[PDB]
Design an enzyme around this catalytic site. Structure first.
Site, PDB file in Angstrom:
ATOM      1  N   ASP A  49       0.812  -1.217   0.000  1.00  0.00           N
ATOM      2  CA  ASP A  49       0.000   0.000   0.000  1.00  0.00           C
ATOM      3  C   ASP A  49       0.849   1.272   0.000  1.00  0.00           C
ATOM      4  O   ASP A  49       1.849   1.354   0.716  1.00  0.00           O
ATOM      5  CB  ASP A  49      -0.918   0.037   1.231  1.00  0.00           C
ATOM      6  CG  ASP A  49      -1.853  -1.167   1.316  1.00  0.00           C
ATOM      7  OD1 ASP A  49      -1.628  -2.167   0.599  1.00  0.00           O
ATOM      8  OD2 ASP A  49      -2.813  -1.114   2.110  1.00  0.00           O
ATOM      9  N   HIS A  81      -1.133   4.545  -0.586  1.00  0.00           N
ATOM     10  CA  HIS A  81      -2.123   5.429   0.022  1.00  0.00           C
ATOM     11  C   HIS A  81      -1.824   6.923  -0.082  1.00  0.00           C
ATOM     12  O   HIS A  81      -1.893   7.653   0.916  1.00  0.00           O
ATOM     13  CB  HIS A  81      -2.378   5.024   1.478  1.00  0.00           C
ATOM     14  CG  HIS A  81      -3.336   3.887   1.597  1.00  0.00           C
ATOM     15  ND1 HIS A  81      -4.470   3.801   0.819  1.00  0.00           N
ATOM     16  CD2 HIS A  81      -3.315   2.769   2.362  1.00  0.00           C
ATOM     17  CE1 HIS A  81      -5.121   2.692   1.117  1.00  0.00           C
ATOM     18  NE2 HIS A  81      -4.442   2.051   2.051  1.00  0.00           N
ATOM     19  N   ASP A  98      -3.662  -0.047  -4.050  1.00  0.00           N
ATOM     20  CA  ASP A  98      -3.939   1.050  -3.111  1.00  0.00           C
ATOM     21  C   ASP A  98      -2.971   2.215  -3.268  1.00  0.00           C
ATOM     22  O   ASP A  98      -2.155   2.493  -2.386  1.00  0.00           O
ATOM     23  CB  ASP A  98      -3.946   0.556  -1.666  1.00  0.00           C
ATOM     24  CG  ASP A  98      -5.248  -0.142  -1.297  1.00  0.00           C
ATOM     25  OD1 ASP A  98      -6.100  -0.381  -2.180  1.00  0.00           O
ATOM     26  OD2 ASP A  98      -5.417  -0.440  -0.110  1.00  0.00           O
ATOM     27  N   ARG A 123      -6.691   8.271   1.730  1.00  0.00           N
ATOM     28  CA  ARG A 123      -6.037   8.442   3.028  1.00  0.00           C
ATOM     29  C   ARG A 123      -4.948   9.527   2.984  1.00  0.00           C
ATOM     30  O   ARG A 123      -4.993  10.495   3.754  1.00  0.00           O
ATOM     31  CB  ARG A 123      -5.500   7.110   3.601  1.00  0.00           C
ATOM     32  CG  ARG A 123      -6.444   5.893   3.513  1.00  0.00           C
ATOM     33  CD  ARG A 123      -7.920   6.215   3.812  1.00  0.00           C
ATOM     34  NE  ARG A 123      -8.118   6.945   5.066  1.00  0.00           N
ATOM     35  CZ  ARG A 123      -8.313   6.366   6.250  1.00  0.00           C
ATOM     36  NH1 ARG A 123      -8.323   5.039   6.355  1.00  0.00           N
ATOM     37  NH2 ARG A 123      -8.487   7.115   7.334  1.00  0.00           N
ATOM     38  N   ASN A 132      -8.024  -2.557  -3.237  1.00  0.00           N
ATOM     39  CA  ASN A 132      -9.449  -2.348  -2.995  1.00  0.00           C
ATOM     40  C   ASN A 132      -9.884  -0.881  -3.042  1.00  0.00           C
ATOM     41  O   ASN A 132     -11.071  -0.597  -3.223  1.00  0.00           O
ATOM     42  CB  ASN A 132      -9.907  -2.991  -1.682  1.00  0.00           C
ATOM     43  CG  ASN A 132      -9.202  -2.412  -0.483  1.00  0.00           C
ATOM     44  OD1 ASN A 132      -7.973  -2.322  -0.459  1.00  0.00           O
ATOM     45  ND2 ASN A 132      -9.975  -1.995   0.517  1.00  0.00           N
ATOM     46  N   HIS A 133      -8.934   0.044  -2.880  1.00  0.00           N
ATOM     47  CA  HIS A 133      -9.227   1.486  -2.999  1.00  0.00           C
ATOM     48  C   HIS A 133      -9.314   2.006  -4.444  1.00  0.00           C
ATOM     49  O   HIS A 133      -9.821   3.103  -4.666  1.00  0.00           O
ATOM     50  CB  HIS A 133      -8.232   2.346  -2.192  1.00  0.00           C
ATOM     51  CG  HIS A 133      -8.473   2.312  -0.718  1.00  0.00           C
ATOM     52  ND1 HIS A 133      -9.073   3.351  -0.036  1.00  0.00           N
ATOM     53  CD2 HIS A 133      -8.225   1.352   0.206  1.00  0.00           C
ATOM     54  CE1 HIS A 133      -9.167   3.039   1.246  1.00  0.00           C
ATOM     55  NE2 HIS A 133      -8.658   1.832   1.418  1.00  0.00           N
ATOM     56  N   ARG A 154     -13.738  -5.970   7.702  1.00  0.00           N
ATOM     57  CA  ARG A 154     -13.977  -5.293   6.427  1.00  0.00           C
ATOM     58  C   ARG A 154     -15.464  -5.051   6.175  1.00  0.00           C
ATOM     59  O   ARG A 154     -15.832  -4.166   5.413  1.00  0.00           O
ATOM     60  CB  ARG A 154     -13.407  -6.112   5.264  1.00  0.00           C
ATOM     61  CG  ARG A 154     -11.928  -6.425   5.362  1.00  0.00           C
ATOM     62  CD  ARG A 154     -11.085  -5.164   5.429  1.00  0.00           C
ATOM     63  NE  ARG A 154      -9.663  -5.481   5.527  1.00  0.00           N
ATOM     64  CZ  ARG A 154      -8.688  -4.579   5.444  1.00  0.00           C
ATOM     65  NH1 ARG A 154      -8.985  -3.290   5.250  1.00  0.00           N
ATOM     66  NH2 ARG A 154      -7.419  -4.964   5.544  1.00  0.00           N
ATOM     67  N   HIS A 209      -2.544  -4.749   1.956  1.00  0.00           N
ATOM     68  CA  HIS A 209      -3.921  -4.585   2.468  1.00  0.00           C
ATOM     69  C   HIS A 209      -4.034  -4.370   3.990  1.00  0.00           C
ATOM     70  O   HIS A 209      -5.057  -3.874   4.469  1.00  0.00           O
ATOM     71  CB  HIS A 209      -4.765  -5.809   2.023  1.00  0.00           C
ATOM     72  CG  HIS A 209      -6.246  -5.677   2.214  1.00  0.00           C
ATOM     73  ND1 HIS A 209      -6.941  -4.518   1.952  1.00  0.00           N
ATOM     74  CD2 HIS A 209      -7.179  -6.598   2.563  1.00  0.00           C
ATOM     75  CE1 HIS A 209      -8.231  -4.714   2.170  1.00  0.00           C
ATOM     76  NE2 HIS A 209      -8.402  -5.969   2.545  1.00  0.00           N
TER      77      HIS A 209
HETATM   78 FE    FE Z   1      -4.782  -0.067   2.257  1.00  0.00          FE
HETATM   79 ZN    ZN Z   2      -6.405  -2.493   1.102  1.00  0.00          ZN
END
Ligand code: FE
Ligand code: ZN
Ligand code: CA
Ligand code: CA
Ligand code: CA
Ligand code: CA
Lengths: 399, 166
Positions: free
Chosen positions: A85, A87, A113, A117, A145-146, A249, A276
């Protein structure tokens, strides 16, 4: 007639670097062959510069077209640097590449990702997309997933695009994200994915088969690849149940050690490499397979001091000469933004309005039917402490 | 029998009279002007960080005090009969310290500093000030005109809060 005073004449904190006022143009970013100049772009972005909208669109769209023609499970060989990640922590991304090596001579795999954030998500996308345009066969990007409409609309990436660029740029990013591959098979030995396993995925062919060009649905194999986590007691479970509902989640599953073992053995794999989940050390090596003595699962996390409060190290995984070496690194300074990118007028005006009106109300209340006769303004906001406080933001947003 | 005072405001005769009564009672030494110290003798104003800004805006002749004309025209900016642009211009004037018609970087910082105190680091505050100006500056002189100010905040409806009864 005297000209205006020099822009930064009455500026109060003069040593603070001031961002460029001009957006990078196409002539500046693209060479004669139509190839982007990555160092010109990087230097501008590091100063918080922006590009012309058509350039952002061109970069995103070209990256999307390259990504779209890749398999949904790509195949990549060692040597390689695997990253988790990011972010939107662009200034940490810069450090990541200094640690990992220049993409001009270093192979990379990112597990997703890139956005949300952190408040430099668009800069992360533009820069990684440009690297993808320049090194299509040595730098690889997976979906996290983002990278979807649902999360970026719930978190700040959509607003980020609206403020710095436009909805056109956001919409272009949504199509580009639909094109990101879901998984990588590394050196015929490691399955790399953002989240993990699915009760509906038993072979690599179950992954290869997926129609990836869409918003990830709320359930099913594509969802699970992006969303699932190892169980909290992974490798030391009571129940032998392979999958259970992921209570953290709010969707998808926890997978346990037996589920991972079965999958590795059925597919002739050595380990699963995923991301993740934030890790204090930047990575986690889970329980070793009895058979191979190698970690059955690996989590890599590449966003140091996540949310500016986790205080965690980041790491990338370097696989070279038959050695997997974890390189850790710490956070880097980054410029400040107000929550949800609001300007200081938007921020302060309600307070100004309230305080001046209050003053006048008090002033006028000096008579009451006699006539008939700190400074109180604030912003808008341990590893285990940061984790528990940020628990709701790890869950899938409603609808 | 002194000379009539001239002014421009939304107020009818009765409202001006009622405001006159408030003015007199606020004017402690009865000098026909209102000093900073007379405003500050109201305990409810003592912790309000925008008091001096409001006084500066009211004091249109710049002698450091608020006479009756200035009092009336100041309060009139908050009349229920006042328009959106009027309330917004008063807000603009809170930031526009030297009254030259343009919010500068240093002023935006200083006025925010009055409100924020130590809730942000100076570096942090300078950075968000810098970006606000860059994003809102449409003609590139580094400062914010009233037109550029409205383009940013005109949708916020804060004007609907800036209203008092008299
Ligand atoms: Fe993440
Ligand atoms: Zn994630
Ligand atoms: Ca007086
Ligand atoms: Ca005066
Ligand atoms: Ca000014
Ligand atoms: Ca201007």
């Amino acid at each position: 007639p005297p000209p205006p005073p020099p822009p930064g004449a009455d500026r109060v904190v003069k040593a603070v670097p001031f961002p460029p006022t001009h957006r990078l143009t196409s002539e500046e970013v693209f060479d004669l062959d139509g190839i982007p100049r990555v160092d010109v772009l990087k230097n501008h972005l590091v100063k918080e510069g922006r590009v012309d909208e058509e350039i952002a669109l061109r970069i995103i769209n070209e990256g999307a077209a390259i990504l779209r023609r890749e398999k949904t499970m790509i195949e990549v060989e060692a040597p390689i640097t695997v990253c988790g990640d990011i972010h939107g922590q662009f200034f940490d991304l810069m450090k990541l590449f200094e640690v990992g090596g220049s993409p001009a001579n270093t192979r990379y795999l990112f597990l997703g990702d890139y956005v949300d954030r952190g408040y430099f998500s668009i800069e992360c996308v533009l820069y990684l997309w440009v690297l993808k345009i320049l090194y299509p066969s040595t730098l690889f990007l997976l979906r996290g997933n983002h990278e979807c409409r649902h999360l970026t609309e719930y978190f700040t990436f959509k607003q980020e695009c609206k403020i710095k660029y436009s909805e056109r740029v956001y919409e272009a990013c949504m199509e580009a994200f639909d094109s990101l591959p879901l998984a990588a098979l590394l050196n015929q030995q490691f399955l790399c994915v953002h989240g993990g396993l699915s009760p509906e995925i038993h072979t690599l062919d179950d992954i290869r088969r997926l129609d990836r060009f869409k918003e990830p649905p709320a359930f099913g194999p594509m969802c699970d690849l992006l969303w699932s986590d190892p169980s909290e007691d992974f490798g030391n479970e009571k129940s032998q149940e392979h999958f259970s509902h992921n209570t953290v989640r709010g969707c998808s599953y926890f997978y346990n050690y037996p589920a991972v073992c079965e999958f590795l053995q059925n597919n002739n794999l050595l380990s699963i490499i995923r991301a993740h989940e934030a890790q204090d050390a930047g990575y986690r090596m889970y329980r070793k397979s009895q058979t191979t003595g190698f970690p059955s699962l690996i989590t890599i996390f590449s966003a140091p001091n996540y949310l500016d409060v986790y205080n965690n190290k980041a790491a990338v995984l370097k696989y070279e000469n038959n050695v997997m070496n974890i390189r850790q690194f710490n956070c880097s300074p980054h410029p400040y933004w107000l929550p949800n990118f609001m300007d200081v007028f938007t921020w302060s005006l309600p307070f100004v309005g309230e305080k001046v009106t209050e003053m006048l109300v008090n002033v006028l209340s000096i008579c009451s039917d006699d006539e008939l006769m700190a400074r109180v303004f604030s912003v808008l906001r341990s590893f285990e402490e940061a984790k528990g406080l940020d628990r709701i933001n790890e869950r899938m947003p409603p609808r | 029998a002194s000379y009539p005072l001239e002014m421009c405001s939304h107020f009818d005769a009765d409202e001006i009279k009622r405001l006159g009564k408030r003015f007199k009672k606020l004017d402690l030494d009865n000098s026909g002007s209102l000093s900073v110290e007379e405003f500050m003798s109201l305990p409810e104003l003592q912790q309000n960080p925008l008091v001096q800004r409001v006084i500066d805006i009211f004091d249109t002749d710049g002698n450091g005090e608020v006479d009756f004309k200035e009092f009336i025209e100041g309060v009139s900016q908050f009349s229920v009969k006042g328009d959106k642009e009027q309330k917004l211009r008063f807000a603009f004037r809170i930031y526009d310290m030297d009254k030259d018609g343009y919010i500068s970087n240093g002023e935006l910082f200083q006025v925010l500093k009055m409100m924020v105190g130590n809730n942000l680091k100076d570096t942090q505050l300078q950075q968000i000030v810098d970006k606000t100006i860059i994003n809102a500056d449409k003609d590139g002189d580094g400062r914010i005109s009233f037109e550029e100010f409205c383009a940013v905040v005109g949708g916020l409806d804060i004007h609907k809060k800036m209203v008092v009864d008299v």
